[PDB]
Amino acid sequence: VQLVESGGGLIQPGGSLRLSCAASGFTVSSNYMSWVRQAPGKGLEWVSVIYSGGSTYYADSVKGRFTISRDNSKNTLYLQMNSLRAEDTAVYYCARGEGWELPYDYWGQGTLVTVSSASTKGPSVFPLAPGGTAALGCLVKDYFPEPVTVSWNSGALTSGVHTFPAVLQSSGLYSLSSVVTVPSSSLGTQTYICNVNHKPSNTKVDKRVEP
Amino acid sequence: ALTQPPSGSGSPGQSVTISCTGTSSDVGGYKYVSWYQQHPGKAPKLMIYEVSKRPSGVPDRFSGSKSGNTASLTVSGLQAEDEADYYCSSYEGSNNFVVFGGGTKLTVLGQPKAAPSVTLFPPSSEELQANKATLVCLISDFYPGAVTVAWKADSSPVKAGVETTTPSKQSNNKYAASSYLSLTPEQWKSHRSYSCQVTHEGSTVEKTVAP
């Protein structure tokens, strides 16, 4: 059984977003499926359910705004979310079952929905640098929204890489850092490039780090 | 609402019991109590359903019960991997209304103490040319998760312009955190040095950088 979600993103209050949950290993059209959400740093909240015969139910806080449905030929579950509010910001999970007679044994991986009028802002990337060893890094500064991911040398360098959790600044923008320790002899012999991917702004920044 | 204590703790090999209290309308009224285990960054995992039933693959040392309006989850033979947030859920008897408790964070005592590694970076040339300056203090590989970060200009404490993350466990099951100090270019160039000092379990680590 596999459940693979997509569709999350940043949306302004009052806007609309459609989430998808692609399933395999069972038939969505003959099963019970639910949406459950988890607000940042908080607990789980049931959102909606669709029964095997097509009956639907919703939590009171989303009724009239959210609609659950499914596409039998695409074996996919959807959540149409209209008139979004800041209170709807959460990771949304799809799960097979209805939460009581059919408990949530199988879950999707979650998709992040951020409801805010703040602008999307791509990061500014700065180098972190000084025989022996050298700690090299990149400072990924002032971006929004999450997530940013960092690769090194287009993914070919993984050993010794540590990318730290982001900090939320008082400005409301995020920053994070990624670091790798290398032999100082390899500087000027080899090239170290951090690849900073910010899918919310469709941008990747490649910064060569050299003392 | 389902009421769960926010925190629980036990030492390895022992037992712990987590409670979840509600009303005759949910826990006391039906046999539809479920328990979920959630690790940070992961979807919840079903541990118990219909009060006391275990799904396939869930070890026998997890057991569920209820008495009156209170449901209980017992973990015997506690192991480090049981460290997680545990959520109880119940059906409320109407319109598929499934409620979750607030979750109980279970800590397993006895993991070895580990001192933090600290790397401190000065501001980059390109950031200084943008009329900005950030010092970056990266803290990793420590246990337990509580650290105190102090920034110093020369020997004098600096509290303004500091942003520090909440420590979180990395893949090695030890904690990492970072601290960022914002300075003007003039402050950076006009002091002999800046230091990041990290205090942890009565021991101190400090690094120093200079223009």
Residue numbers in the entry:
A (entry chain H): 2 to 82, 82A, 82B, 82C, 83 to 100, 100A, 100B, 101 to 126, ...
B (entry chain L): 3 to 9, 11 to 27, 27A, 27B, 27C, 28 to 95, 95A, 95B, ...
From the paper:
Neutralizing antibody responses to coronaviruses mainly target the receptor-binding domain (RBD) of the trimeric spike.
Accordingly, the CDRH1 and CDRH2 loops of both neutralizing antibodies share similar conformations and contribute more to the antibody-RBD interface than their CDRH3 loops. Thus, they are functionally equivalent in terms of V-gene-determined mAb classes. Superposition of VH domains from unrelated antibodies with longer CDRH3s suggests that RBD residues 456–457 and/or 484–493 present a steric barrier limiting the CDRH3 loop lengths that are compatible with this binding orientation. We suggest that the key feature of the VH3-53/VH3-66 mAbs identified based on CDRH3 sequence similarity to m396 (Cao et al., 2020) is their CDRH3 length (11 residues), and these mAbs will share the C105/B38 binding mode, not the m396 binding mode.
